[PDB]
Design a protein around this ligand. Structure first.
Ligand code: DCP
Ligand code: CA
Ligand code: CA
Lengths: 953, 397, 392
DNA sequence: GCGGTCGAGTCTAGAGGAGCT
DNA sequence: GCTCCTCTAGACTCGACCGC
C-alpha cells in the first residue's frame, strides 16, 4: 500500500513521494527514543488517541538534481543567482573615475566618461548599476533627477518636468514618465527607487533584481527596537560599535567610516519646490553623487560579509524574489478611495452633529440647578454673565388706515435704532448661556461663525462628559494631577453628587472597596467616591489625556467603555468613532500609493483579447516599497500592505486588499501556511528531543490538533483559563517568541482589567508551568540562541552582529529566541520562492510573484495556468517541508502538513474566497458593484484530478 | 405621549383617530396635513426643488396633467374618469338592451381617461420640447412635483417629486450611482438620525436594475424614494415612429438617451422627518431650520400694549420682507404663562421666540429664546433680522 | 402672434392644434413650457405671499382632488370608477340587464368625484383651523391647486381664499378683498386699465363681484368673488351647531363664507398677453429668467470659471440665472440680445477679456436697452436691490 | 484708575516614525 | 525589558490694549 506510519502512530508521507524525495532504505527508529516519547506522551495523556488516516497521494515529482534535497535547492538557487552575482562581483571589482565636474541638463540619460565628458544615451546599457532617485515631493510622485554609476562610466538622468518649461502636467502617471532601464540595480532603500522604473510596471516580468543595502545591513548588523532606542538615545554597550541605524550616514560610518555624510539643510526635494531645485541643480547632483558613492562603498563592504554570514544561495535568491512585488490594480482603486473618503467625511459630520446635539441638550440642566446632580457635568462652569448696558370684530381697515398704520409701525421701529450708541462697542459673547457652552460656540464677530456649539470636538475634556462615558459602570472624571479616570461610588468619607454615582452603578449592576485597578488615589478627594485612573498602555505612572485614543477601541468593544445616559446620540458617536478609526489613522498612506497606469499598447495580447476586458478601463500596478529585511529577523516590512488588516463590516476602507485585482487573462493564485511558526517550533522540539515527529507533546498536539474539532493549541489554551481565541493566540505566539512571565501577566491584566496583579501572576505561572509540553522546544531555542554564532537551522544564515554573545554577553536573549523562529520562517519563505520560480521556469508557466504577507504567498499567474500553478504550489510546499525536516535530521514528513489545505484562485487579494467584504464604504459587496465572482479553494486531491497529476501542458 | 397625537394637537396632522392610524397615514387616501404640516411639506419640496434643479445643470420644470389617455392594458388598476351625464343618458333616455350596456361598460375601459400613477409618463411627453430647449444636447433632465393617484375600494393620493434623467447608456450606471448618493445625502442632510435612512438595490419584473431608499419608521422600513434604470423602451413607446427625433447628441454622436427615473415621496418624507425629529424630557420637535414651518415667534407682555404692539407689528413687517416665517403670538386674546407658551413653541418646532417687553421702548433690547438650548439672550431689535438671516444661511449651507 | 412667440420660447407647449384660443382657455392640455411653468410658479408665489404672508389669520390648506361623491344629479364632475370592477362584471359571472343597470346606478350613487372648486376643501378643515385660531373670527383658508371642469376634462389651477366672517361685516370684507385683488392684479401689469371689475348676481341671489382682463378677443373672468353666507357651512356640517360657531366678541355666531377664487393659469396667460422688435416686458418679480451670463473673445477655461462663479453667486443669493455661456453654438451678439429679449430676461451679463483684466462685467437692461459696465462684486447687490424695488 | 477680553507662551498628552523623497 | 523625534491638539497662564 501507499500508507506509511510512525512509531507514535502519526501518518507519514506516502511511499511514492517518500521514495522520490528521501530515497529508499531509511533507518530503523531507536527503541530507547520511542520508549521515552511514549512515556512522555502517556504522562500528558496524549498517547493512544484515535487518528483518522488521510487519503494517500501519489505524484511524479520533477527530477530532483543532486543526491539529496539540499543539493537540488542549492543548484536551483545558484542557477537563479548566477547572472546577478556576476554583476555584483563586477561592481566589486570595478574601477571608477572620480565624479564629473559639471553635470548636463538635457533630457534623458547622460553618460560621463573620462574627464567628465557629457554624452546622452537612451539607456545606461549596462548589466549592473547603483541607483538613487530624487523626486520633487511638491510637484508629485514623478521622479525629478537620478544619478547612477556603472563600471564603465558615470551616468545621470533628469525628467522632462525638470528640464522642459511646460505647464502643469496630467495627474495620472504613465510608464513613459519614469526612468528607463540580466540586470542588477543596487541602492539604499532601493524599494523606493524601484518604483520609479519604467520596466518595473509591465505585466510581463523583466530580468531585473534589486539588492537593498538596508536589508543586507539588517541581516548583517541589524538593530532591534530596544537596541534602536538605546542607539538613538546614546547618539554592556560594546555592541554599539558594530551596529548602526538604517540611515545611509550611519551605515557609511559603520562599514566604511571616514568623513561622515551631512544631509543637505536646503531639503529642496523634501520641502522646497521645483524652482528651488532648478536653482541649486549642481549642489543637488553633487549630494546625490555623494549618496551613490557611499552606497557603492557600503555594497562593497557588505556583499562579501553578507555572503559569508549567509552562505546558502537560497537566502539571496529569496531576497531577490521578495523585491519584485507586483500588486495589479484597476480603475476600481480610485472608486474605493473616493468612497472611503466620502464615508469618512459623512461620518465625521454625523458625529459632530451628535456632539452638538448632546451639548445643546446639556444646557437644560441649568434650570433648577439640576446640573449639580449630573454625574458628569457637575464640575463645569455654569455661570451666567449679566448683560451690560452703558372685542367684536372691527371691520377691514381702509387704504389710508392701513397705509398710516404701516408707516407709523416703520417709524416706531426706526426710532429704536438710535439706541445703538447706548450699547457697548464690544458686544458680549452669549452672556445668557452657561460658561462652558460659551467656549464651544464661536463669537458672532468671527467670520467663520457657525450656529450652535460648532467648536466642540472629540479631543476636548467635555465630550466624554457630554457623552456620559462610563468605565465598567463608573462615570469618567478628569483630574489635573492624574489626567482622566473614573469614580467608584460607595465611599463614606459644587459638590460631586456621589448619590447619583451610587444610583447609576446600582442600575448598571442590576441591569448587567470592591474594585481593583490603577489605585484609589485619595489625593483627589472627591466626596463619596474614589478616583481610579484609566489603565494606560505605558504604565500606571502615566496618565491618560483622552479616552478616545486608539488604545481604548478594544476596551470599548468589550462593553466596558460605554456611553450611558443620552443614549439617542451618545453611543452613536462612539460607534462612529469606532467605524472610522482605521481610515482616520491610515488615510494618508493609502491615498499616497504610487499608482501607475499602463497604456493599452504596453499591455500583453492576452489582456486585450479577453471577454472580461473593457476598453474604457485602466489597469495599473502598485509596487510596494517593501524592505526585504526590515527587522533583525529579516522579515519584509510595509505599513500599508504587509499587515494583518482584513475587511470588516464596521470599518471604513478596510477592503484595500480586495482592490488588488488581477488583470483580464490573469488570475491570482495564493496559499496560506497553516501555523508556520508553530510547526517550526514543534519540529525543532521534535528534532531536539528524540529525532522523530510527534515525540514532544507540543509537536504531537500541533500535528493532531484541529481548530474545528477543538484540539488545536490556541483553542486548548483559551479553554484552559477562559480567554478569547485571539487573546490566546497572542499569548501563545508571545510565549513561543520567548516572552517571560511578566509579559503574560501584563497581557492578562490588559485583556481582563478585573484580574489583579497577584492573580495574573498566578495564572501566568500556572500556564507557563503547564516537565511541560514545550520544554524541549524551548531548550532547543535557548541552545541555538546561546551558541557562539547563532545560525538558522535550515539555511545557516548567521544572526546580526549586534546580537552575537561576543558583544552582548548575557543580554538580549528574548530577542534571539524570537529571532530563531522568525528567521526560520524567513528561510521557509525563501525556499518557497526559489522552488516556485524554478517550477515556473522549468515547465513554462506564465506568472510572477505578487506579494508575501506574513505567511501567505501570492502569484499573478495566467488563468490558463491556474491549476498548473496550484500543483506547483503544492509541490513547492511539499519540498519546503521536506527540506525543513531534512535539515533537522528527519528524513520523513507527516502527511497532515505535506500539502496545502486550500490553494486559492481568486480575482482579488481577499483573505478568503467566500468573503464578500462588506464595509461602510462598500456596503453592497465586491461582486455587487465591481464584478468579482467568488474564487475556488482546492485541496491537493482536487488539483491532481484537474491537472492529470502532471505539470506539463 | 404618541407623536401622532402631538402632531394633531399642533396641526401637523389632521383627521379623526381612525385616520391617524399607521395604515391610514401610509395610504394617503385622506388629507393628513394641517397648516403647519402643509408649510413643512412646502419647505421640504422647496429644498428638493432647489437641490435638484436650481443647483443642478440642465434640469428644467415640467407640468403634466392629472389625467392620462385611456388604455386597454391587461391589468391597469388606475381609476377611470366617467362622465355622469353620459351614464344618466344611457340609463334613463332610450332604455337600451343588455348587449348595449355590456358595450357601454366595455367603452368605459377603452376611451375613459385614467388618473396618473407616476410622473414618468408626463416628463416623456415633453422630451422633444426640452430637446429643442437645450439644442438637442445631453445630458438634461426634467423635474416635477405633483400628486399621483394609487389604488388602495378607495383612491389614495401621494405627492411625488420625480426627476427623469436622460443620459446615454455608457454613463447610465455612474449617473444612477451618483443620483443615489446625492438623494441619500439630501435625505440625511435634514435628519437628526441619518442612520435611519437606508438604501437597497431592487429588480423589477423585466429585469431592470435600480435602487430604493428607505426610512426606519418605528413599525418598519418604508420605501420613501425609488430609482430605476429604464432603457430606451419608454421613449420608443411614447414616440412610436421615426427615431431621429428621439436621438440626443452625445457630443459628436446622436444616441437615444437612457431614462433614469428618480421618484421620491414627499408626504412619506414629511412623516419620516416628523418621526426623526421626535426623540422616540421636554417634548420638542427638532426639525431642521430649513424645514421648520415657523422660525420666529413674537410676544407682548406688561404693557402699555399699544406701543408694544406697534413695535411688534413693525418688527413683523421687517422680518416678513426678508423671507422669514413669523408666528404672531401677540395678537392672541387668550394669554397663557410663559412656560406653556414655550412648551407650545417647542412642540411646534419654532426656532426662536421673541418677547418684546415695555423695556424695549427705552433701549430696544428684546428677549430671544432658542429652541435648541432653551436659553434667553438679550439682543437689540436692529440686530435681530441680521442674526436670523445669518443663522438661516449658515443652517442652509 | 404672441402664441407662436411663447411656443418657440417654451412659455407655451402643445401642438399647433392645441394653441387655439378655445384649447388654451379649456385647460384640457398642459399649456405651459418650462419658462411658462416658472412664470406661473412666480405668480403663485406672489399670490401666496400677498394673501397669506402679508395677511392676518390666513393659513394654508391641503385638500384631496376627490370628493366623497353623491347621487345629486346636477353634478357634472367626472367620477372615479375602478376598472377592475368593470372587468369583473364583463369577464366573469356575466350578469344580466337588471344587474348591469344596478351596477351603473351604483357608480353614480356611490363613487369618487373630481373637485370643481376648492371651496369644499377648506370647509372640511374649518373646524381644525377654527381651533387653531382659538375660534377667533375672522380667519381665512388659502390654497393653490388644480380643479377639474368638464368642457375631455379641462384642468385649471385655481388660487382660492375662503374668508370666514360674521354676517354683519360681510360687505365691507368683500369690498376690501375686491379692491386688494384689483390692486394685486394691476401691480404686475404694464397696462392696469386692461383689468376691470363688474358686479354680478348668483342664481340664488347672492351678491358678488368678478375681475376681468381685456384679452384681444374679449373679456374673460380671471377672478370671481361671492358672498355665500352660512348655507355651505351648514350643508357641510349638519347636526349640532355649537361646533361651527366662531367668536365675534362676546357673542358667538356661525360665520359667513366669502369665496375669493382666481385662475392662475388664465392669470399667467393674461400677464403674457400684457407683456407684449419682439420684446416681452414681464414684471421683474414675475420674470422667469433674470440674469443671463455670456462670454466673449476667450479664453475658455478662465472665463467659464468666472461665469461659473458668478452663477453659484446668484444661485446662493436666490436669483435665477440662465447659463448662456455653456451653449456650444456661438450665436451673434445681436441674436443673443434678441433671444434674451424674447425670453423676458431682466439683465444680461457679458464677460470679456476686460473682466479678466479689471473685473468689470457689462450689464444690459432689457427695459432701456442700454449697455453699462459694472464690477462683479456689486452685481449681486444691484440685482437684489432692483428686485426689492420692483416688489414695492 | 482699573478691570474685561484677547493674543502669544508654554506645558502636556496623543500620534507617526525610527528608511527613502 | 522599552529611548528618541516632529507633530497636532488642547488647556492653563500672564502680559496688555482699551473702554468704562
Ligand atoms: N498572535 C499571532 C498570530 C500570528 N502571528 C504571525 C505568525 C503567522 O505566521 C502569521 C499569520 O498568523 P495568523 O494569526 O493569520 O494565523 P495563525 O497561524 O495564528 O493560525 P490560526 O489563525 O488558525 O491560529 O502571523 C503572530 O506573530 N502572532
Ligand atoms: Ca534610495
Ligand atoms: Ca494561515
Amino acid at each position: 500500500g501507499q500508507l506509511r506510519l510512525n512509531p507514535l502512530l502519526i501518518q507519514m508521507l506516502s511511499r511514492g513521494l517518500h521514495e522520490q524525495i528521501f530515497g529508499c532504505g531509511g533507518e530503523m527508529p531507536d527503541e530507547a527514543a520511542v520508549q521515552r516519547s511514549v512515556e512522555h506522551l502517556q504522562k500528558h495523556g496524549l498517547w493512544g488517541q484515535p487518528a483518522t488516516p488521510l487519503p494517500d497521494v501519489e505524484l511524479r515529482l520533477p527530477r530532483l538534481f543532486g543526491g539529496n534535497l539540499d543539493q537540488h535547492f542549492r543548484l536551483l538557487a545558484q542557477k537563479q543567482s548566477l547572472p546577478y552575482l556576476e554583476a555584483a562581483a563586477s561592481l566589486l571589482e570595478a574601477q571608477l573615475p572620480p565624479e564629473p565636474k559639471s553635470w548636463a541638463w538635457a533630457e534623458g540619460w547622460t553618460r560621463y566618461g573620462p574627464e567628465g565628458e557629457a554624452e546622452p544615451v537612451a539607456i545606461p546599457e549596462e548589466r549592473a548599476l547603483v541607483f538613487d532617485v530624487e523626486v520633487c515631493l511638491a510637484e508629485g510622485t514623478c521622479p525629478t533627477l537620478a544619478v547612477a554609476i556603472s563600471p564603465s562610466a558615470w551616468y545621470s538622468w533628469c525628467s522632462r518636468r525638470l528640464v522642459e518649461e511646460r505647464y502643469s502636467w496630467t495627474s495620472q502617471l504613465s510608464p513613459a514618465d519614469l526612468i528607463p532601464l540580466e540586470q542588477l540595480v543596487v541602492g539604499h532603500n532601493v524599494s523606493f527607487d524601484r518604483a520609479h522604473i519604467r520596466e518595473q510596471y509591465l505585466i510581463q516580468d523583466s530580468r531585473m533584481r534589486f539588492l537593498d543595502t538596508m536589508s543586507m545591513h539588517m541581516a548583517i548588523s541589524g538593530l532591534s527596537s530596544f537596541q534602536r532606542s538605546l542607539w538613538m538615545g546614546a547618539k554592556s554597550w560594546d555592541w554599539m560599535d558594530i551596529s548602526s541605524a538604517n540611515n545611509l550616514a550611519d551605515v557609511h560610518n559603520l562599514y566604511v567610516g571616514g568623513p561622515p555624510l551631512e544631509k543637505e539643510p536646503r531639503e529642496l526635494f523634501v520641502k522646497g519646490s521645483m524652482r528651488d531645485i532648478r536653482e541649486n541643480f549642481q549642489d543637488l547632483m553633487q549630494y546625490c553623487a555623494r549618496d551613490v558613492w557611499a552606497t557603492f562603498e557600503v555594497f562593497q563592504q557588505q556583499l562579501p560579509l553578507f555572503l559569508e554570514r549567509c552562505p546558502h544561495p537560497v537566502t539571496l535568491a529569496g531576497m531577490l524574489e521578495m523585491g519584485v512585488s507586483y500588486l495589479p490594480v484597476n480603475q476600481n482603486w480610485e472608486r474605493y478611495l473616493t468612497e472611503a473618503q466620502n464615508t469618512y467625511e459623512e461620518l465625521q459630520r454625523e458625529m459632530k452633529k451628535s456632539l452638538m446635539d448632546l451639548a445643546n441638550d446639556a444646557c437644560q440642566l441649568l434650570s433648577g440647578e439640576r446640573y449639580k446632580e449630573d454625574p458628569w457635568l457637575w464640575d463645569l462652569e455654569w455661570d451666567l454673565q449679566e448683560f451690560k448696558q452703558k372685542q367684536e370684530d372691527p371691520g377691514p381697515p381702509s387704504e389710508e388706515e392701513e397705509l398710516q398704520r404701516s408707516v407709523t409701525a416703520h417709524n416706531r421701529l426706526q426710532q429704536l435704532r438710535s439706541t445703538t450708541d447706548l450699547l457697548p462697542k464690544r458686544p458680549q459673547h452669549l452672556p445668557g448661556h452657561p460658561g462652558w457652552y460659551r467656549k464651544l460656540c464661536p463669537r458672532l464677530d468671527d467670520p467663520a461663525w457657525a450656529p450652535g456649539p460648532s467648536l466642540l470636538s472629540l479631543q476636548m475634556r467635555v465630550t466624554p462628559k457630554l457623552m456620559a462615558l462610563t468605565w465598567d459602570g463608573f462615570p469618567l472624571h478628569y483630574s489635573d494631577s492624574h489626567g482622566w479616570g473614573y469614580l467608584v461610588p460607595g465611599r463614606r468619607d459644587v459638590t460631586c453628587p456621589y448619590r447619583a454615582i451610587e444610583s447609576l452603578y446600582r442600575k448598571h449592576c442590576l441591569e448587567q472597596t470592591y474594585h481593583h485597578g490603577n489605585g484609589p488615589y485619595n489625593d483627589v478627594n472627591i466626596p463619596g467616591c474614589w478616583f481610579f485612573k484609566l489603565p494606560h498602555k505605558d504604565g500606571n505612572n502615566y496618565n491618560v489625556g483622552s479616552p478616545f485614543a486608539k488604545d481604548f477601541l478594544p476596551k470599548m468593544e468589550d462593553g466596558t467603555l460605554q456611553a450611558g445616559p443620552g443614549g439617542a446620540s451618545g453611543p452613536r458617536a462612539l460607534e462612529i468613532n469606532k467605524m472610522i478609526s482605521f481610515w482616520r489613522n491610515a488615510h494618508k498612506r493609502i491615498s499616497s500609493q504610487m499608482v501607475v497606469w499602463l497604456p493599452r499598447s504596453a499591455l500583453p495580447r492576452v489582456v486585450t483579447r479577453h471577454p472580461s476586458f473593457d476598453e474604457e478601463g485602466h489597469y495599473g500596478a502598485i509596487l510596494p516599497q517593501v524592505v526585504t529585511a526590515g527587522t533583525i529577523t529579516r522579515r519584509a516590512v510595509e505599513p500599508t500592505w504587509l499587515t494583518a488588516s482584513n475587511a470588516r463590516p464596521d470599518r471604513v476602507g478596510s477592503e484595500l486588499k480586495a482592490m488588488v485585482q488581477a488583470p483580464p487573462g490573469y488570475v491570482l493564485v495564493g496559499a496560506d501556511v497553516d501555523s508556520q511558526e508553530l510547526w517550526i517550533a514543534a519540529v525543532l522540539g521534535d528534532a531536539h528531543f528524540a529525532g522523530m515527529h510527534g515525540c514532544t507533546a507540543f509537536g504531537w498536539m500541533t500535528l493532531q490538533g484541529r481548530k474545528s474539532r477543538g484540539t488545536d493549541l490556541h483553542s486548548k489554551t483559551a479553554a484552559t483559563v477562559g480567554i478569547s481565541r485571539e487573546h490566546a493566540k497572542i499569548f501563545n505566539y508571545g510565549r513561543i517568541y520567548g516572552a517571560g512571565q511578566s509579559f503574560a501577566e501584563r497581557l492578562l491584566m490588559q485583556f481582563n482589567h478585573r484580574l489583579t496583579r497577584q492573580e495574573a501572576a498566578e495564572k501566568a505561572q500556572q500556564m507557563y508551568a503547564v516537565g511541560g509540553t514545550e520544554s524541549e522546544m524551548f531548550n532547543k531555542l535557548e541552545s541555538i540562541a546561546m551558541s557562539d554564532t547563532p545560525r538558522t537551522p535550515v539555511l545557516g544564515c548567521c544572526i546580526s552582529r549586534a546580537l552575537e554573545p561576543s558583544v552582548v554577553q548575557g543580554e538580549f536573549i528574548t530577542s534571539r529566541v524570537n529571532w530563531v523562529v522568525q528567521s526560520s520562517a524567513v528561510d521557509y519563505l525563501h525556499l518557497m520562492l526559489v522552488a516556485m520560480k524554478w517550477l515556473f521556469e522549468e515547465f513554462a508557466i506564465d506568472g510572477r510573484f505578487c506579494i508575501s504577507i506574513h505567511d501567505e504567498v501570492r502569484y499573478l499567474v495566467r488563468e490558463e495556468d491556474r491549476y498548473r500553478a496550484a500543483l506547483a504550489l503544492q509541490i513547492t510546499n511539499l519540498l519546503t517541508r521536506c527540506m525543513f525536516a531534512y535539515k533537522l535530521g528527519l528524513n520523513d514528513l507527516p502527511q497532515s502538513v505535506a500539502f496545502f489545505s486550500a490553494v486559492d484562485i481568486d480575482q482579488c487579494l481577499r483573505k478568503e474566497v467566500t468573503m464578500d467584504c462588506k464595509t461602510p464604504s462598500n456596503p453592497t459587496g465586491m461582486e455587487r458593484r465591481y464584478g468579482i465572482p467568488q474564487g475556488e479553494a482546492l485541496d491537493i486531491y482536487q488539483i491532481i484530478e484537474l491537472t492529470k497529476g502532471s505539470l506539463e501542458k | 405621549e404618541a407623536l401622532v397625537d402631538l402632531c394633531r394637537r399642533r396641526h401637523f396632522f389632521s383627521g379623526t383617530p381612525q385616520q391617524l392610524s399607521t395604515a391610514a397615514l401610509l395610504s394617503g387616501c385622506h388629507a393628513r396635513f394641517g397648516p403647519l404640516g402643509v408649510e413643512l411639506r412646502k419647505n421640504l419640496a422647496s429644498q428638493w426643488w432647489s437641490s435638484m434643479v436650481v443647483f443642478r445643470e440642465q434640469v428644467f420644470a415640467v407640468d403634466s396633467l392629472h389625467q392620462e389617455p385611456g388604455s386597454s392594458q391587461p391589468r391597469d388598476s388606475a381609476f377611470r374618469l366617467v362622465s355622469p351625464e353620459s351614464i344618466r343618458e344611457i340609463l334613463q333616455d332610450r332604455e337600451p338592451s343588455k348587449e348595449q350596456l355590456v358595450a357601454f361598460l366595455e367603452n368605459l375601459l377603452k376611451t375613459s381617461g385614467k388618473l396618473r400613477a407616476t410622473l414618468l409618463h408626463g416628463a416623456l411627453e415633453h422630451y422633444v420640447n426640452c430637446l429643442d430647449l437645450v439644442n438637442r444636447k445631453l445630458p438634461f433632465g426634467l423635474a416635477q412635483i405633483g400628486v399621483c393617484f394609487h389604488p388602495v375600494t378607495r383612491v389614495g393620493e401621494k405627492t411625488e417629486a420625480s426627476l427623469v434623467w436622460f443620459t446615454p447608456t455608457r454613463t447610465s450606471s455612474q449617473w444612477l450611482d451618483f443620483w443615489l448618493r446625492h438623494r441619500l445625502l439630501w435625505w440625511r442632510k435634514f435628519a437628526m438620525s441619518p442612520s435611519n435612512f437606508s438604501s437597497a438595490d431592487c429588480q423589477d419584473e423585466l429585469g431592470r436594475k435600480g435602487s430604493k431608499l428607505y426610512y426606519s419608521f418605528p413599525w418598519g422600513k418604508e420605501p420613501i424614494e425609488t430609482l430605476w434604470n429604464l432603457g430606451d423602451q419608454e421613449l420608443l413607446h411614447t414616440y412610436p415612429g421615426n427615431v431621429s427625433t428621439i436621438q440626443g447628441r452625445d457630443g459628436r454622436k446622436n444616441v437615444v438617451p437612457c431614462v433614469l427615473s428618480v421618484s421620491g415621496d414627499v408626504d412619506l418624507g414629511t412623516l419620516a422627518y416628523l418621526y426623526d425629529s421626535f426623540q422616540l424630557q421636554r417634548k420638542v420637535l427638532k426639525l431642521h431650520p430649513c424645514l421648520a414651518p415657523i422660525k420666529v415667534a413674537l410676544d407682548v407682555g406688561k404693557g402699555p400694549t399699544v406701543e408694544l404692539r406697534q413695535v411688534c407689528q413693525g418688527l413683523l413687517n421687517e422680518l416678513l420682507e426678508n423671507g422669514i416665517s413669523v408666528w404672531p403670538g401677540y395678537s392672541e386674546t387668550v394669554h397663557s404663562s410663559l412656560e406653556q407658551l414655550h412648551s407650545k413653541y417647542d412642540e411646534m418646532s419654532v426656532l426662536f421666540s421673541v418677547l418684546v417687553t415695555e423695556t424695549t421702548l427705552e433701549n430696544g433690547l428684546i428677549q430671544l429664546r432658542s429652541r435648541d438650548t432653551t436659553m434667553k439672550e438679550m439682543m437689540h431689535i436692529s440686530k435681530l433680522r441680521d442674526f436670523l438671516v445669518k443663522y438661516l444661511a449658515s443652517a442652509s449651507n
